[PDB]
Amino acid sequence: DRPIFAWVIAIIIMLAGGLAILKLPVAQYPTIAPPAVTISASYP
Amino acid sequence: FGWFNRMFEKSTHHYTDSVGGILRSTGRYLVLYLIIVV
Amino acid sequence: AIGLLVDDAIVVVENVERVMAEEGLPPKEATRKSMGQIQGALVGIAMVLS
Amino acid sequence: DLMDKEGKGLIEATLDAVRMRLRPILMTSLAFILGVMPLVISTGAGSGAQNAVGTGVMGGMVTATVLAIFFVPVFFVVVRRRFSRK
Amino acid sequence: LPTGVGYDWTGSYQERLSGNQAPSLYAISLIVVFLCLAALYESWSIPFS
């Protein structure tokens, strides 16, 4: 169709997505195990 | 009233001719634009 | 905002006011082929104001 | 719009364009400065924040139309930017 | 200063005000404004005006 208007749409994605890589956790596997709390006392 | 007659004059003469008058030149009002930025 | 609000109100109205004189023409269809000249901006200006 | 659908107007489209629309600029911009007017002075204790806002737009709108309809860019631009080469 | 005496801020931006902040905000305000002025325009001249 027309070049510019489309290229401008793709340049949002050059940012936004690239902005997301400088703003969303870079860590390992995401929380998998169902989460649990742990009580812990001590009678010496 | 005056009012209309007035505005129609400025817009025509006065303005538009003085715009083709400046448009004629260029490098004087460009060196002015950069003087503005400084 | 009150300023950047009647600005967008003013252009659509007064661009009819010329097109009803520049080619003396009250009717509906004047309004129509004025947003031929007006609206090309309107969405574009809204994209850069943002 | 004139440069395309209508005729070139190398400089006689840019000129012919404000020949038909100095009205809306100096009608809004005047309406804007007057709506900001009650904040710049007039109110002087109820909220002094009104002074902080209006002072930095009344000042700028004087220099946003008496300049941008004129002298420095907004005519001059399209000329050397669009034309002059390619 | 003497040994065993450091420092730490409180609490004194941690990220605020005119920038730092501002520039990066304006920066993108400039990187976008040009687009939009092309999504309805086309060229390499219109948006510079």
H runs (alpha helix) in chain A: 3-14, 17-21
Phi and psi (nearest 5°) for A35?
A: -80, 145
Which position has the token pair 């006011």?
C17
Residues of C with CB under 8 A from a CB of D: 2-3, 6-7, 10-11, 14-15, 17-18, 22, 37, 40
- Alpha carbons B2 and D68: distance in angstroms, whole number: 27
The closest of D69, C6, C14 to C22, measured between CA atoms, is C14
The closest of B5, E41, B23, C20 to D20, measured between CA atoms, is C20
The whole-angstrom distance between D57's CA and the closest CA on chain E is 18
Which position has the token pair 């010329």?
C18
Phi and psi (nearest 5°) for C47?
A: -75, -30
Decide if D29 contacts D64 (C-beta within 8 A): yes
SS3 A1: coil
Q: What is the 3-state secondary structure (H, E, C) of B1-35?
A: CHHHHHHHHHHHHHHHHHHHHHHHCCHHHHHHHHH
SS3 D13: coil
Strands (E), chain C: none
Q: Considering only CB atoms, which chain B residues are within 8 Å of D75?
A: 19, 22-23
- Alpha carbons B34 and B28: distance in angstroms, whole number: 10
Decide if C32 contacts D42 (C-beta within 8 A): no
Give the number of other Cβ atoms within 10 Å of residue E38's Cβ: 21
> In this structure, what DSSP letter does residue A34 have?
P
SS3 A13: helix
Decide if D75 contacts B21 (C-beta within 8 A): no
- Alpha carbons D58 and D40: distance in angstroms, whole number: 8
> From which experimental method does this structure derive?
X-ray
Contacts of D29 (CB under 8 A, 6+ apart): D61, D64, D65
Interchain pair D31, C2: CB under 8 A: no
> In this structure, what DSSP letter does residue E44 have?
S
Contacts of A8 (CB under 8 A, 6+ apart): E35, E36, E38, E39
Task: Select from E45, E46, E48 the residue whose CB has the most chain D CBs within 10 Å, as the one to mutate to test that interface.
Answer: E45
- Alpha carbons D7 and C42: distance in angstroms, whole number: 23
Tokens representing A16 are 């936004």
Chain D (32-51) residues lying within 8 Å, Cβ to Cβ, of chain C: 32, 35-36
Q: How many residues does chain A have?
A: 44
Can you state the angle between helices D49-65 and D22-40, rounded to 10 degrees?
160
The 10 Å CB-count burial string (b at 16+, else e) for C4-42 is eebbeebbeebbbebbeeeeeeeeeebbeebeebbeeee
- Alpha carbons A1 and A6: distance in angstroms, whole number: 9
